[PDB]
């Protein structure tokens, strides 16, 4: 299929320049009708940033125009967004998207990448177990910054009964999140349960076994 993939999430300091790329697979970037970016501040709606058309002409959101550059790199088959002089009001999930042919109805979207603009610094999490006819068990992913973390169970084999909660921002300025799952109590002695934690901003991956 056509797939779009934004570069990874992280942190940008205020006044500095946010730089994102979107790798396109399954379609030649130079053939696309337009490529662009939209963002979504946390708990809010969508906001268009800008687009670049097949011609090379760009159109940007007038409120952002002085700070935005969108360009295409045909050797990498990717397009980019640079947003200069950022502030906390630029904190958002950024999506890349494109309409590959002008006759298409649906654009192809990326998955979104959260960029946090903050004077705080990147910190990886600690992962602690929440040890267990039904038993609950989980992982506590504590003391990380910025968002997000992802959590899977058993390398994606275990999905039923999993609940990964929104993170909370502690008074320390660091996030904490829990992920839990409910399983049969009989399985505790025979089935291994591992939570797979990824904090892309700090490049921290941990696979934590949770023992009864």
């Amino acid at each position: 299929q056509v797939q779009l993939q934004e570069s990874g999430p992280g942190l940008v300091k205020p006044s500095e320049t946010l730089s994102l790329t979107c790798a396109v697979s399954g379609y030649s970037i130079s053939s696309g009708y337009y490529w662009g970016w939209i963002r979504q501040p946390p708990g809010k709606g969508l906001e268009w940033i800008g687009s670049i058309y097949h011609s090379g002409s760009t159109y940007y959101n007038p409120s952002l125009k002085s700070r935005v550059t969108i360009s295409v790199d045909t050797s990498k088959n990717q397009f980019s967004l640079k947003l200069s002089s950022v502030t906390a009001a630029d904190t958002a999930v950024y999506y890349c998207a494109g309409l590959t042919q002008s006759s298409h109805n649906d654009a192809n979207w990326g998955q979104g990448t959260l960029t946090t603009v903050s004077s705080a610094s990147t910190k990886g999490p600690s992962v602690f177990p929440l040890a267990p006819g039904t038993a609950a068990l989980g992982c506590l992913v504590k003391d990380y910054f910025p968002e997000p973390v992802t959590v899977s169970w058993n390398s994606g084999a275990l999905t039923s009964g999993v609940h990964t909660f929104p993170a909370v921002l502690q008074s320390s300025g660091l996030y904490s999140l829990s992920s839990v799952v409910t399983v049969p109590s009989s399985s505790l002695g025979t089935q291994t349960y591992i939570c797979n934690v990824n904090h892309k901003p700090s490049n921290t991956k941990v696979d934590k076994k949770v023992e009864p």
């Binding site: 809010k44 007038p62 600690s126 909660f165 993170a167």
Partner: protein, 215 residues
């Protein structure tokens, strides 16, 4: 971020219909085609309707749109638990730039379900690092309103916990909630009984789950 106005939320039971309105002005909706998107939690928007009333391939005819004047409407019939999501309208403005509504969350109504409650002591691994987090989980309840009270040696805790709630479950329409009580290690070791007491419409009286440190 938003330009067009949508209600914050709509709700109905499975099998029922909801409509979601999107109100604009003569220079956006009044002059331009409206599109609608569904955003399941943690995913990108997905097109439901374009050119006011057309469905792209893959979208079933339970979704429909229309436009009248400076307003548009999305209809969803035959509601399923999978339709729990945020919905957005979009159009172009007088400069032919894309603009969005602020989103409407769709909640699916279901029967009352009491939470199952679990408490987790701090791990030895965390206590070795100097801190103690006690976690209380309220699993798969409905409706969303729930109250957790922490007690430490019968002292009601106020202000030293934080909680969060899942989006509505895509299969059974329930919520789950996690609450963390944080103490220092030194404080955790001064007290014995840690308790989470839960009040919910599904419970005829509050449920308490507790443990004694080190027992």
């Amino acid at each position: 971020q938003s330009v067009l106005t949508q209600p914050p939320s709509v709700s109905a039971a499975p099998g029922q219909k909801v409509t979601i309105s999107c109100s604009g002005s003569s220079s956006n909706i009044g002059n331009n085609y409206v599109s609608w998107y569904q955003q399941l939690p943690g995913t990108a928007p997905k097109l439901l309707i374009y050119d006011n009333n057309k469905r792209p391939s893959g979208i079933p005819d339970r979704f429909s749109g229309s436009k009248s004047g400076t307003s548009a409407t999305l209809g969803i019939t035959g509601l399923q638990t999978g339709d729990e999501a945020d919905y957005y309208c979009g159009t172009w403005d007088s400069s032919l730039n894309p603009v969005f509504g602020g989103g409407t969350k769709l909640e699916i109504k279901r029967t009352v379900a009491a939470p199952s409650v679990f408490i987790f002591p701090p791990s030895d691994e965390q206590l070795k690092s100097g801190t103690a987090s006690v976690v209380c989980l309220l699993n798969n309840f409905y409706p969303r309103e729930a109250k957790v009270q922490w007690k430490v040696d019968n002292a009601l805790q106020s202000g030293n916990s934080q909680e969060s709630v899942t989006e509505q479950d895509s299969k059974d329409s329930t919520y789950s909630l996690s609450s963390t009580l944080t103490l220092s290690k030194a404080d955790y070791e001064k007290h014995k009984v840690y308790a989470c007491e839960v009040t919910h419409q599904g419970l005829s009286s509050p449920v308490t789950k507790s443990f004694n440190r080190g027992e």
